């Protein structure tokens, strides 16, 4: 399937691709927004008559998008959600067209046995719903969040790169009777500047900031109380993709010390496919940013990566806009937002 049909009917595909490839598009949220807009454009314009064929077309589009860029998960997720939204309505329609029992909301046994309408507006509304969801995660978190941390305790903070995490911290810091001391690891060849910014913000906020060299984690772990990951994406068996560098080692340390690890994210960040590898998903940075020189630097083959993967085991809770979930449980949440056939396009 090529862009042969999508020409003077829809244009912005190419623009999207450009944004993906050269990185003029920045932050998962923005990508998601872009995808939503694309979907809106698709809907306001494309010509149907049928329904299954339309679904197939949409699937193909999704596939194409994936092929254009994989690290953008939000894009995929939103598409999947909208497909799911459509699907339920389609199912409802079919029941009226033809003219049922199940123990709970969905079934395994309904997959074994043999099983024109106004869906477009519903589809439109789905997109709006998605947009609204995207709008605020934090305004559905800080009620399950300004609860866990207490007085005279000590936080450990890797990945000051997810805009959500900072906000979460600051909401907690707001209270005039609650007090905590904050340790912040750097993350060097991908995060330093961000970390510095975060530190500055903390200082501004009138709270006790502590700047840490990425080495010196072990000389302070005796006093450590909590662990917060600044993840970018979330997956099937619980685990997360993170907004780059200096998270994995610290998590491992925490696990060794048995010092609690929390995950703060969102369900637009939530994805309906397994990270069978880290290799196919997590991408690498630029060897140029570490060291100068070039002709002795054909010999100096240096390795540095942007994104970070963490195994399901070290992390314990995923507090959402919906509420507190677990690595064992998050799969069902995903299923509650994207349907069973939508997993594979």
């Amino acid at each position: 399937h090529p862009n042969a049909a999508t020409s003077d009917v829809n244009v912005t595909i190419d623009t999207f691709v450009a944004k993906l490839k050269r990185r003029q598009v920045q932050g998962s949220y923005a990508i998601a927004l872009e995808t939503l807009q694309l979907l809106m454009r698709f809907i306001s314009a494309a010509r149907w008559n049928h329904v299954n064929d339309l679904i197939e077309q949409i699937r193909d589009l999704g596939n194409s998008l994936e092929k254009a860029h994989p690290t953008a998960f939000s894009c995929g997720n939103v598409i999947r959600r909208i497909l799911a939204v459509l699907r339920d309505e389609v199912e409802e329609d079919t029941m009226s067209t033809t003219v049922v029992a199940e123990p709970l909301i969905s079934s395994m046994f309904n997959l074994l046995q043999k099983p024109k309408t106004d869906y477009r507006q519903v589809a439109i509304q789905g997109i709006k719903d998605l947009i609204d969801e995207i709008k605020n995660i934090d305004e559905g978190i800080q009620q399950i969040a300004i609860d866990l941390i207490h007085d005279h305790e000590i936080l450990l903070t890797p990945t000051p790169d997810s805009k959500t995490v900072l906000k979460f911290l600051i909401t907690a810091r707001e209270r005039s009777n609650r007090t905590f001391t904050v340790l912040v690891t750097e993350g060097f060849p991908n995060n330093t500047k961000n970390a510095h910014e975060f530190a500055k913000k903390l200082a501004q906020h009138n709270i006790e900031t502590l700047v840490v060299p990425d080495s010196a984690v072990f000389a302070l772990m005796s006093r450590v109380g909590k662990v917060i990951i600044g993840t970018k994406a979330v997956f099937v068996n619980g685990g997360t993709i993170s907004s780059n560098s200096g998270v994995s080692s610290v998590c491992e340390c925490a696990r060794e010390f048995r010092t609690p690890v929390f995950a703060v994210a969102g369900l637009y960040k939530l994805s309906p496919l397994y990270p069978f590898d880290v290799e196919k998903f997590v991408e690498f940075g630029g060897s140029q940013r570490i060291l100068p020189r070039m002709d002795p630097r054909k010999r100096l083959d240096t390795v540095n990566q942007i994104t970070d993967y963490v195994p399901p085991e070290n992390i314990d809770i995923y507090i959402t806009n919906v509420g507190g979930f677990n690595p064992s449980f998050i799969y069902r949440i995903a299923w509650d937002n994207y349907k069973q056939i939508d997993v594979h396009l």
């Binding site: 029992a101 123990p103 709970l104 969905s106 079934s107 395994m108 046994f109 074994l112 046995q113 043999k114 099937v236 068996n237 619980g238 496919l273 397994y274 069978f276 590898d277 290799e279 195994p311 399901p312 085991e313 690595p327 064992s328 449980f329 998050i330 799969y331 069902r332 069973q340 997993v343 594979h344």
Partner: protein, 302 residues
């Protein structure tokens, strides 16, 4: 109309369809005799047959699981609450249909399951399950850099048999004794174990050793794996560190001897917990977090 005879049928033959499939087929055949219409005549007879099977069973719980699954399916069937013939016909259809399904499940597996192979990552295969072998043999079709490691199993020389099946397709290997497998911490990248039963918490029943392997994996942080199709589901949860229905012996400090007669006595079959396993292999899309318990909930509702 007999089930023990049917069970004794498949033994040295096999090598085609899953065992629990043949049993299911037999059950279905039994069902289409005493009428699924008359519920008083049928369900009781089915129960009796199951009891007979249990009585005849040595070291297994999987047949039980299969038959209860079948029962559940049957129960689900009549939820259209209309004509009493179509449903019956559907029930009749659904036995060889189950057999047919396994193939399709396998096909599904051989595409989503081949997403997993990483560059120079040595594989070790535990137990005797058809599915694991199929997946491993299906990964060689795409010529992916990998390796296989065998373990010296002792029920009826299983390990040897396993290593004898990997030499047919020509695949370099080395053999590892169940005692010796301790040293295997880095070089084998991924620890695979095939499942003869999965229940509530994603806990697993197989052969002469799984729990120890799991423990070892946990110690090294190396990922541990559960590999099958989809039919091995019971409503089970064990009490102690390990508990099962046993036709074999649970620790016999054997009586005074000098000439060798009876001493081969210990845990032949072993269970593993929830925390040890990172990835679950089924044809049920991609799920491992908590699809087992939820599946059971969906099925039984009790």
């Amino acid at each position: 109309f007999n089930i023990t005879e049917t069970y004794l049928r498949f033994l040295e033959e096999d090598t085609e369809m899953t065992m629990p499939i043949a049993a299911i087929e037999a059950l279905v055949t039994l069902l289409r005799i005493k009428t699924p219409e008359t519920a008083a005549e049928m369900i009781n007879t089915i129960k009796s047959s199951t009891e007979e099977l249990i009585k005849s069973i040595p070291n297994s719980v999987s047949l039980r699981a299969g038959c209860d699954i079948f029962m559940r399916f049957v129960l689900r069937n009549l939820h259209l609450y209309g004509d009493w013939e179509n449903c019956k016909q559907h029930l009749i259809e659904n036995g060889q249909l189950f057999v047919s399904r396994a193939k399709k499940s396998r096909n599904k597996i051989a595409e989503i399951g081949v997403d997993f192979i990483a560059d120079d990552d040595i594989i070790l295969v535990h137990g005797y399950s058809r599915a694991v072998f199929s997946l491993l043999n299906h990964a060689a079709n795409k010529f992916i850099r990998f390796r296989c490691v065998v373990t010296e199993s002792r029920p009826s020389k299983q390990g040897n048999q396993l290593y004898t099946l990997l030499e047919q397709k020509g695949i370099p290997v080395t053999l590892i004794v169940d005692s010796a497998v301790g040293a295997v911490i880095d070089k084998v990248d991924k620890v695979f174990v095939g499942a003869e039963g999965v229940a509530e918490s994603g806990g697993i029943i197989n052969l002469v050793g799984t729990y120890s392997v799991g423990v070892l994996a946990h110690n090294a942080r190396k990922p541990f794996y559960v590999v099958t199709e989809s039919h091995k589901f019971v409503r089970m949860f064990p009490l102690s560190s390990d508990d099962l229905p046993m036709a074999g012996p649970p620790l016999d400090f054997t009586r005074r001897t000098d000439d060798l007669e009876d001493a081969l006595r210990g845990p032949t079959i072993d269970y593993t917990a929830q925390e040890y396993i990172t990835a679950l292999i089924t044809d049920l899309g991609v799920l491992t977090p908590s699809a087992v318990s939820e599946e059971l909930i969906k099925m039984w509702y009790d």
